[PDB]
């Protein structure tokens, strides 16, 4: 009837030639711009920040959670992201602790139309959300990171804050000393110079910190309340668990505070500690009015990301033109479309080879 | 490492490897056990479920259906409701797929159809109702609505009970008239009836519509069998419902997923303490059932993501007896899970 659909499938090989083929600092650029242009959107109410994500509980082997990310554009699309958090991975599995995968559905039909990795993807678009609220909130002759936890998120924090500001020394800690130990190997390509340097030093030398562990539950904070420089802005990127927190509250109650997603930061983010007049205007209206960012560079400020699924369908786009340039990925009829739309039997099997 | 892909062609293969009787029969028998260790207490029932309206063409949903095994795997189907689907695009309403995720890890380990297997295992889900509701010696089924799950649930239920004929209606000329082809291979005769006649005639009905959300009921509360065992199988929005509130109020009524029914299915029209025990509960029990089958009754199916986790391992299994399928490294599982630009060769 209609022309044959199938799912566009990307995989890790098609991933990884849109990232040699575009250049990692391209597609960073092109991530950021796209997050930029959408999030001033949304400030402006031309589009809706996506609704409440939902997720399970796992306790085992160490407390985690696997959530799915619903984004609907009207008419047109539905994105929905399928992650795991699960922190034990790294040191009981040998796997990233952030595991999954974005899908899009053609909103008219209901169609699967494309599915992709959607750990590369997670990790730009998290690093592009930091360099957008960094370019409004740190001030624009920033030289020195600082990174706490120097996991996965670390190394495109470190990427997208390279773009956007001038900097010169990343000053890094984990609390796992093989996994600060090897940060400098896996941020080389960005040309900054690393140091492995104690959570107080970071506090006390950092123009920007980015702070991305998985710390349990109960058990922040990761950075101390000590000495900070005046314009210090931190990008707060751990979440996962309700429970789990970052930054010492006396340091959120100094600060300039913007939520990436207000409802769900005040149950999931840093602003789980704070009550809703300790937080400043979002991040979105600070993109549509950048005036609003008036004098924040020069004091404290704190954006507290969690992570939304419109920020998955943006960066996903990016990816799928990217890909549709370079003629990259697999067509896969994975949903059983029958001749006959009533017949659920009407089942067509592999043809015969020619004899 | 790989995530195994289960496609239009692979589900074919399979119900041609097992045979649709036989598949069919399967699903029935593992969703019996596993109803019935959720009446025992062994298992749960699947959470709410979450969903996006639609308004264009006409209203659908969109939904997201999770159940998670803790300690082996979360499945998630995710499917439309688009009641245009067949005539504007060819089609079918119900369009979904069924992803498999290792709960330990959350890595995604399989991913098929979800379009089959829902008419499947939503089938085989009347059939052990009717098992447990309808006269063993039912003759006369009756079907309201004669779209894709109509089928299935002929199929279905010709397998439990011993069905001779078909009456059935559709509001849409064209598919009521198709319904005798789709329907030939269960060698039950199918005639044309009205409403009123099938509920005059019928020993076991399945409603099955895409009727809009307040235009119900869509079978008259116009005299019906002693013994009538309905299977009110239609839901998507809220406000829909397919059943006479006067003939809900003379029935016995199990649900699949009570929670859930009292809130999208037809017991909605119902309060709480009006319901008989759940179907996970008659399948742990089927004593408790006694005497029912000779009265009116009414299954009241939604659907939950159990059903589908169960059906898709009768597929898995089914698949991997004849290799079925192909892997694909989709998740980028970096060696270095630190370095999410650590991609991967050689
Ligand atoms: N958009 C978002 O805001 C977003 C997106 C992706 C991930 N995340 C979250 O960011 C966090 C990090 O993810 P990841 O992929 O980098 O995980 P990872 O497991 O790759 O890295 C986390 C690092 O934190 C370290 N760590 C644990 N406790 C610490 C402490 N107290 N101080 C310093 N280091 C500590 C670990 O040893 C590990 O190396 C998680 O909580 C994850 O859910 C958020
Ligand atoms: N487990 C469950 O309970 C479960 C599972 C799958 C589908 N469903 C539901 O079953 C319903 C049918 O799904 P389908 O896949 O067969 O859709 P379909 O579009 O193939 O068939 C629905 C049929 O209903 C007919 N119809 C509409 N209004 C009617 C009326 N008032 N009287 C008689 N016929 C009418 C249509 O003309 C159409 O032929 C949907 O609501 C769907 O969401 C339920
Ligand atoms: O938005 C994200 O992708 C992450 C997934 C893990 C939990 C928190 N946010
Ligand atoms: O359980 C199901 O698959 C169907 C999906 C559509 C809404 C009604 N229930």
Known sequence: RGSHMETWVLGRRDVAEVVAAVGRDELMRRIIDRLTGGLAEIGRGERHLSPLRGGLERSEPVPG?????????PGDHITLKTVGYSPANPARFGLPTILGTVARYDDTTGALTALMDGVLLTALRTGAASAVASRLLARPDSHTLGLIGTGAQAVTQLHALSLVLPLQRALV??????????????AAF??????????????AEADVISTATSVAVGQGPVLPDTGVREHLHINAVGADLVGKTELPLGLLERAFVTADHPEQA?????????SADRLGPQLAHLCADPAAAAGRQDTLSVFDSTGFAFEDALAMEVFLEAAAERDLGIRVGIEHHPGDALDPYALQPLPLPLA
Do not use: Y
Request: hydrophobic residues 35%; charged residues 35%.
């Open 173 to 186: 800690w984990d609390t796992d000393p093989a996994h600060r130990e090897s940060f400098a190997r896996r």
């Open 190 to 203: 960005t040309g900054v110079s690393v140091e492995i340097a104690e959570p107080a030093r970071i506090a």
């Open 266 to 274: 005040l149950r999931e983010g840093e602003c789980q500690q704070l």
């Open 65 to 73: 959670i696997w959530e799915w990310m619903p984004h609907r554009e």
